[PDB]
Design a protein around this ligand. Structure first.
Ligand SMILES: *[C@@H]1O[C@H](CO)[C@@H](O[C@@H]2O[C@H](CO)[C@@H](O[C@@H]3O[C@H](CO)[C@@H](O)[C@H](O)[C@@H]3O)[C@H](O)[C@H]2NC(C)=O)[C@H](O)[C@H]1NC(C)=O
Ligand SMILES: *[C@@H]1O[C@H](CO)[C@@H](O[C@@H]2O[C@H](CO)[C@@H](O[C@@H]3O[C@H](CO)[C@@H](O)[C@H](O)[C@@H]3O)[C@H](O)[C@H]2NC(C)=O)[C@H](O)[C@H]1NC(C)=O
Ligand SMILES: *[C@@H]1O[C@H](CO)[C@@H](O[C@@H]2O[C@H](CO)[C@@H](O[C@@H]3O[C@H](CO)[C@@H](O)[C@H](O)[C@@H]3O)[C@H](O)[C@H]2NC(C)=O)[C@H](O)[C@H]1NC(C)=O
Ligand SMILES: *[C@@H]1O[C@H](CO)[C@@H](O[C@@H]2O[C@H](CO)[C@@H](O)[C@H](O)[C@H]2NC(C)=O)[C@H](O)[C@H]1NC(C)=O
Ligand SMILES: *[C@@H]1O[C@H](CO)[C@@H](O[C@@H]2O[C@H](CO)[C@@H](O)[C@H](O)[C@H]2NC(C)=O)[C@H](O)[C@H]1NC(C)=O
Ligand SMILES: *[C@@H]1O[C@H](CO)[C@@H](O[C@@H]2O[C@H](CO)[C@@H](O)[C@H](O)[C@H]2NC(C)=O)[C@H](O)[C@H]1NC(C)=O
Ligand SMILES: *[C@@H]1O[C@H](CO)[C@@H](O[C@@H]2O[C@H](CO)[C@@H](O)[C@H](O)[C@H]2NC(C)=O)[C@H](O)[C@H]1NC(C)=O
Ligand SMILES: *[C@@H]1O[C@H](CO)[C@@H](O[C@@H]2O[C@H](CO)[C@@H](O)[C@H](O)[C@H]2NC(C)=O)[C@H](O)[C@H]1NC(C)=O
Ligand SMILES: *[C@@H]1O[C@H](CO)[C@@H](O)[C@H](O)[C@H]1NC(C)=O
Ligand SMILES: *[C@@H]1O[C@H](CO)[C@@H](O)[C@H](O)[C@H]1NC(C)=O
Lengths: 429, 38, 149, 50
């Protein structure tokens, strides 16, 4: 049985969207050349398909963030007073001093992840801007944070209802499986394990350089793919030269078409390969975004019983934060501390009738017997208010034999002895 | 009509086309006090 | 496209298995608000779910306390919350207003009442004692009649 | 109301991984030939992507 506990804060990072992009039909293949475009016109309607696919990808990219970050239709705001019963939330609420309304952890996340090459991309390759600017995302995150600390989990089900924080944590512990009183007798301790732990988060993100790898890989892949696409067009593909104007100005109109045909086929194949790769990556990012949306809906707006879903250990609560092309969850969870050994029995019968615990387990320190909870040590005397009887005690295997102190014996004998004394006094006259 | 970068266009009022900035939602506040419950 | 449709179909199968055949405790999974039940319907190349859900209506704000110390011993609610309309206290459920007098059938004791923060003072109408008083009063009356002559 | 119970065991199979693999351009495309590789060098960087 454990006799102490600890509170731990875990971090989790999830990508939510990739960079939108677009390509040009003709400036990539036949840049500033009339004859090349005239001949390319006879190859059908390929780049129309490419344009449709890329437009679909961009629309899906906008929809991913719109779905993930917009689960509340009322923008709450935190009260000016910042005394939440001993808990210190100064590390996650927005900082008014900075021109950008962001907290400490958001600033660290933005600084750690870093984004002439764009100027070099004159070859009809552009990057479109996202629909939701970063300030709006930060404001959504602030709304979630201010709604999850002043109303509990109620604002995700209907009208928001206020409630003190020191009572919300009691409700959370009652949800875990340990009675609420263990909070009210240790409040000053518990806050000290929270305010400290959150601080240790800030260093950790800046401790190792591989913490933000999942967010960095997306931009690295996008930049690498664009760079390869740009550098591809330096290859002859079996023709006489990689420069399109040299072929026309050095040869007549009867065989130069063959070599420009080879070149155009090569470039078309490269562009199609790039489009297919983008489709695959977009599908993967969409799956990750759906998982992130589920995590945001379940871990934050409520309390999850799914083991090992919103953090190792028994779950207490969570806080969201934004990051370039992604989200970061901070899971606050509860973990049993050092434990002690004990001797236990399944049942206990006194008057030829077996007794079973209503909730908890029997336990013994060597000489006496007690009944306690499962996730904490708190011995109490065995009472009929703690146990229920069922059948005889000749069929259960492993039963022990010890007296049971029926609380009805206090509640009635405390008057029965007085009544007997009154009768004994009444006998004399 | 999503234009981009937080700018959206629409057709409104004697009628024409306008462009504006999105509104995330109606602002709301919750009265929080350490001995009050709803 | 087939891969995307397969993912959607798996999600729909999970929705049918969990929301319909049972009751779901996963928040915002089978509909906004607390979940009650669901009904399925078919559609060309798809399924349609009708989720029935329960949403709290208009609310009132009261003054609350964490615990109550009566005989120098703190008390905590077995299930519910302490609320007061201004004069004297009651214990209610959390999702509905239903005031009841404070009773030992509703509260359990734990230690002394000088370690909890924010505790208040009130008498606890401990009910097993009036249960036995239903006989104690008649006992006292019958003893008074016994000693009267 | 039921008056009795039974305990049953069900089995479920789930794939977790597929066999790794690797390919080589030069020997697959240009079989033990030098001119073919010399003229394949001019086709860009498909092989690096693969
Ligand atoms: C296992 O737990 C039981 C229950 O706490 C322990 O029994 C308790 O032992 C302490 C230490 O002696 C007792 O405190 C003192 O006992 C004397 C006995 O005359 C009394 O005069 C003092 O006023 C004081 O209470 C305590 O009474 C006793 N519990 C009961 C119900 O009598 C037991 O020692 C533990 N076993 C171990 C530690 O191996
Ligand atoms: C807060 O709630 C308590 C509990 O209901 C209220 O005290 C009780 O209020 C009721 C309704 O007014 C009283 O019943 C009425 O008493 C009058 C007295 O003349 C009687 O004529 C009526 O037939 C009816 O029985 C009840 O007596 C009263 N309890 C006590 C101990 O006085 C209290 O008024 C509420 N406070 C506020 C500000 O609403
Ligand atoms: C709930 O009831 C308890 C007892 O019925 C109250 O405890 C009492 O609190 C007062 C001050 O709040 C104590 O008065 C102090 O007495 C000492 C002498 O012991 C004196 O030196 C101080 O200057 C002060 O006057 C009083 O002693 C104490 N009662 C006992 C038995 O110790 C409690 O205050 C009540 N709570 C509320 C919120 O009213
Ligand atoms: C339960 O664990 C906590 C955490 O270790 C204990 O509090 C520590 O107590 C030691 C003294 O034994 C102090 O040096 C530490 O500073 C305390 N930690 C904090 C965060 O304040 C607590 O004493 C343990 N409870 C029991 C009954 O052993
Ligand atoms: C909540 O935590 C913050 C961060 O540690 C506290 O602010 C620090 O307070 C110490 C106290 O001397 C100063 O030395 C630091 O310079 C402060 N840092 C910042 C960034 O302000 C804050 O005081 C805590 N809240 C309370 C109520 O104590
Ligand atoms: C209580 O549980 C511990 C946990 O194993 C038992 O083991 C003791 O401590 C370590 C850890 O296993 C062993 O290496 C020791 O040899 C054990 N102690 C002894 C004295 O052998 C421990 O024996 C258990 N004790 C009781 C009374 O149940
Ligand atoms: C608890 O009580 C039962 C019944 O009083 C005890 O059962 C007795 O066991 C002994 C041998 O162990 C027999 O000789 C007696 O005849 C049994 N009692 C009866 C009434 O038949 C049981 O032993 C007690 N528990 C312990 C640990 O001694
Ligand atoms: C519940 O079902 C089980 C299995 O059918 C019953 O166990 C059988 O009971 C009969 C009658 O005593 C025995 O002949 C069989 O050998 C038992 N089966 C096994 C596998 O042991 C059990 O009796 C039923 N319980 C009730 C209350 O009807
Ligand atoms: C536990 O096991 C030991 C040895 O395996 C045995 O002697 C003892 O009787 C067992 N206890 C119970 C309650 O079955
Ligand atoms: C509520 O907070 C204020 C300011 O922090 C404090 O003065 C007051 O005592 C608190 N209420 C209770 C019941 O402690």
């Amino acid at each position: 049985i454990p006799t102490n506990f600890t509170i731990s804060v875990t971090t989790e990072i999830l990508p939510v969207s990739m960079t939108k992009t677009s390509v040009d039909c003709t400036m990539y293949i036949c840049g500033d050349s009339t004859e090349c475009s005239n001949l390319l016109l006879q190859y059908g309607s390929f780049c129309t398909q490419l344009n449709r696919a890329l437009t679909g990808i961009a629309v899906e990219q906008d929809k991913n963030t719109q779905e993930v970050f917009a689960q509340v239709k009322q923008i709450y705001k935190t009260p000016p007073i910042k005394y939440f019963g001993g808990f210190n939330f100064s590390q996650i609420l927005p900082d008014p001093s900075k021109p950008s309304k962001r907290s400490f952890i958001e600033d660290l996340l933005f600084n750690k992840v870093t984004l002439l090459i764009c100027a070099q991309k004159f070859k009809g390759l552009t990057v479109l801007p996202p629909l939701l600017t970063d300030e709006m995302i930060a404001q959504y995150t602030s709304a979630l944070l201010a709604g999850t600390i002043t109303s509990g989990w109620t604002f995700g089900a209907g009208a928001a209802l206020q409630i003190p924080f020191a009572m919300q944590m009691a409700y959370r512990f009652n949800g875990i499986g340990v009675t609420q009183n263990v909070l009210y007798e240790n409040q000053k301790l518990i806050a000290n394990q929270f305010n400290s732990a959150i601080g240790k988060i800030q260093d950790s993100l800046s401790s190792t350089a591989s913490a933000l790898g999942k967010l960095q890989d997306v931009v690295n892949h996008n930049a690498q793919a664009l760079n390869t696409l740009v550098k591809q067009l330096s290859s002859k593909f079996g023709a006489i030269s990689s420069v399109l104007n040299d072929i026309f100005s050095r040869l007549d109109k009867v065989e130069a078409e063959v070599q420009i045909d080879r070149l155009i086929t090569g470039r078309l194949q490269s562009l199609q390969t790039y489009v297919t790769q983008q489709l695959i990556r977009a599908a993967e990012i969409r799956a990750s975004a759906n998982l992130a949306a589920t995590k945001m809906s379940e871990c934050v707006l409520g309390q999850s019983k799914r083991v090992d879903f919103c953090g190792k250990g028994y779950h207490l609560m969570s806080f969201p934060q934004s990051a370039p092309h992604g989200v970061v969850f901070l899971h606050v969870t509860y973990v049993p501390a050092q434990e002690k050994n004990f001797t236990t029995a399944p049942a206990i019968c006194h008057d030829g009738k077996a007794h079973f615990p209503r909730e908890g387990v029997f336990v013994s320190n060597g000489t006496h017997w007690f009944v306690t909870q499962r996730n904490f040590y708190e011995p109490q005397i065995i009472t009929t208010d703690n146990t229920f009887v069922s059948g005889n005690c000749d069929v259960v295997i492993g039963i022990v034999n010890n007296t049971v102190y029926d609380p009805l014996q206090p509640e009635l004998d405390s008057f029965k002895e007085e009544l007997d004394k009154y009768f004994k006094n009444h006998t004399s006259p | 009509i999503p234009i981009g970068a937080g700018i959206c266009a629409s057709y409104q009022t004697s009628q024409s086309i306008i462009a504006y900035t999105m509104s995330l939602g109606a602002e709301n506040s919750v009265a929080y006090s350490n001995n009050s419950i709803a």
